[PDB]
Amino acid sequence: QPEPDMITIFIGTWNMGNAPPPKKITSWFLSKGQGKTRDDSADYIPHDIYVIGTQEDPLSEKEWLEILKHSLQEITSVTFKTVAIHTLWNIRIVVLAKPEHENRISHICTDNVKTGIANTLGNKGAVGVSFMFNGTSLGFVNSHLTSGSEKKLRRNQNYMNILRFLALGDKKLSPFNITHRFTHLFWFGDLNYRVDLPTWEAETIIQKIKQQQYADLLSHDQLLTERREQKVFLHFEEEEITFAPTYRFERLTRDKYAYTKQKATGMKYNLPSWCDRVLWKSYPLVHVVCQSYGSTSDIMTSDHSPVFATFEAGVTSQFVSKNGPGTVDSQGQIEFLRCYATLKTKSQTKFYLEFHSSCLESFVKSQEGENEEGSEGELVVKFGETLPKLKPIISDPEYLLDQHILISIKSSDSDESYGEGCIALRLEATETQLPIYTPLTHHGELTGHFQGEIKLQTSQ
Ligand SMILES: Cc1cccc(C(=O)N(C)C)c1C
């Protein structure tokens, strides 16, 4: 029974509006409704992994698990195994997998982050799950961010708190936040970004939605515009949106957007918006293809419609050779030529690098680089030919070309990371000097760049 090189992952996000679901929710898991929908010919084909994110979820974990498992059994005739479930207040994540994957999944982690302080601490934040699927690390974040059209900056701040403080994945990757710990990271939820148009334009917006003309609305979507301006979700992807805004509906129909200010809304307008979103970030040159992104039309208990997204995602096997794991394979090496970091910092400390990768027995610290001034004010940290030769555990190119090296540039004075990035070993050639590049981030904000050349020796 061969190990897979691809899996499909279903991501669902639904703000349930504190109401129990209707008796049938199978359209959600089948990616049917509006937007990029799944072909009918696939309906009986189970996804490998289903990850369900809810917000304003009134159900117990037991009640929701029973609905989800019975839903998937009805669709697929497969009884899914529960990988993980985690709830913060009314924010929940469930991970279900086909039983054949039970012995492929390990290192299951769960965590939550509460956002805000005093006033603003008490119902918003995030839950997450991570695990290994054979050789591939997967992370999943369900967040319910701050509501209200005039709070996009609060949402951005909530995002940064969540990616700093959510403790998922390999704790040995100590310089790295969740935006670097996973082969594939999926981040979804009621992100609560709105269509920023004047209140007086509400009926105009509704007209545009009825005509399925989303372009003049998406050009004012706060998540797209904040992402454009590098204020949030730097280096994440989102599929094109081709479904109607998923908020705010009258319950028990989808024929009506309820946007007018009410005591129940704190006298706020809720212009139709794409509150409910799925984004992802995968390591460079790993296969990931969005195969659906849309909203259901037939689930109407909430003032939000469910959103679905499905993905093909590349995975690797749990590789064993005669040598590693448990030793190095001297027919493998990773070398670095002409390397330098460019940093945005105004500070003057010495810097060194740390290389982290599951292809190494443990992380590697470099010597300090040589600081120079860039021609436009920048700090340039030169490593030249001084970086260590990295000794992978396995030399087979079928393993090594699928790996990645995480890089942190650290202050000698404080040992604090000033920037993190990731280099793919999926090279065009071995035993050949080739350019490498990553942006560097810290707390998910751009802090610099790392560039140079690599020379990879495999056993072939
Ligand atoms: C809407 C948005 C915002 C920020 C970055 C991107 C992106 O990945 N580009 C390659 C431009 C996009 C598509």
Tell the residue number behind the tokens 């290994």, with chain if given.
132
Report the distance separating Cα 203 and Cα 198, nearest Å. 11
Which atom of ligand 1 lies closest to the CA of 236?
8
- CA 227 to ligand 1 center in whole angstroms: 7
Report the distance separating Cα 58 and Cα 16, nearest Å. 8
Considering only CA atoms, which of 410, 406, 440, 446 is closest in space to residue 423? Answer: 406
Which atom of ligand 1 lies closest to the CA of 238?
13
Q: What is the DSSP letter of 392?
A: -
Report the distance separating Cα 26 and Cα 24, nearest Å. 6
- CA 221 to ligand 1 center in whole angstroms: 13
Contact 407, 304 (CB under 8 A): no
Which residue's CA lies nearest to atom 5 of ligand 1? Answer: 228
Type and span of the H or E element at 411: strand 404-411
Which atom of ligand 1 lies closest to the CA of 230?
4
Q: What is the DSSP letter of 260?
A: S
Query: Taking CB atoms and a 6 Å cutoff, what residues make up the pocket around ligand 1?
Result: 224, 227-228
129 strand-pairing partners: 110, 140
Which residue's CA lies nearest to atom 3 of ligand 1? Answer: 228
For ligand 1, mutation pick of 225, 228, 231, 239 (most atoms within 8 Å of CB): 228
**Experimental technique used?**
X-ray
- CA 173 to ligand 1 center in whole angstroms: 28
- CA 311 to ligand 1 center in whole angstroms: 19
Phi, psi of 75 (to 5 degrees): -70, -50
Considering only CA atoms, which of 209, 198, 199 is closest in space to residue 249? Answer: 209
| Token pair for 51 | 């990850």
> For the chain, what percentages of helix, strand and coil (3-state, to nearest 5) are there?
15, 35, 45
Considering only CA atoms, which of 248, 269, 257, 252 is closest in space to residue 210? Answer: 257
- CA 250 to ligand 1 center in whole angstroms: 32
Which atom of ligand 1 lies closest to the CA of 233?
4
- CA 108 to ligand 1 center in whole angstroms: 31
> What would you report as the CA-atom Rg of the chain, rounded to the nearest whole angstrom?
23
| Token pair for 436 | 């490498």
Q: How many CB atoms lie within 10 A of CB 179?
A: 22
Considering only CA atoms, which of 239, 227, 229 is closest in space to residue 278? Answer: 239
Considering only CA atoms, which of 353, 368, 322, 315 is closest in space to residue 451? Answer: 353
Type and span of the H or E element at 452: strand 445-457
- Give all strands of the β-sheet with 434-442 in edge-to-edge order: 364-365, 351-356, 404-411, 417-424, 434-442, 445-457, 333-343, 379-384, 370-373
Q: Which long-range contacts (CB under 8 A, 24 or more apart) does 206-214 make?
A: 206/257, 206/259, 206/272, 209/244, 209/245, 209/257, 209/272, 212/244, 214/241, 214/242, 214/244
Contact 440, 411 (CB under 8 A): no
For ligand 1, mutation pick of 191, 225, 227 (most atoms within 8 Å of CB): 227
Cα–Cα distance list, 85 to 13, 51, 191, 410 (Å): 15, 10, 20, 36
Report the distance separating Cα 191 and Cα 340, nearest Å. 37
Considering only CA atoms, which of 307, 336, 302, 322 is closest in space to residue 407? Answer: 336
One-letter amino acid of 369: G
Instruction: Give, rounded to a whole angstrom, the gap between the first and last alpha carbons of the chain.
Output: 27
- CA 446 to ligand 1 center in whole angstroms: 15
- Give all strands of the β-sheet with 125-133 in edge-to-edge order: 105-114, 125-133, 136-144, 184-190, 276-282
Which residue's CA lies nearest to atom 6 of ligand 1? Answer: 228
Contact 350, 369 (CB under 8 A): yes
Which residue's CA lies nearest to atom 10 of ligand 1? Answer: 237
- Experimental resolution (Å): 1.4
Which residue's CA lies nearest to atom 1 of ligand 1? Answer: 224
Contact 227, 155 (CB under 8 A): no
Which residue's CA lies nearest to atom 7 of ligand 1? Answer: 237
Contact 118, 88 (CB under 8 A): no
185 strand-pairing partners: 139, 281
Q: How many CB atoms lie within 10 A of CB 430?
A: 16
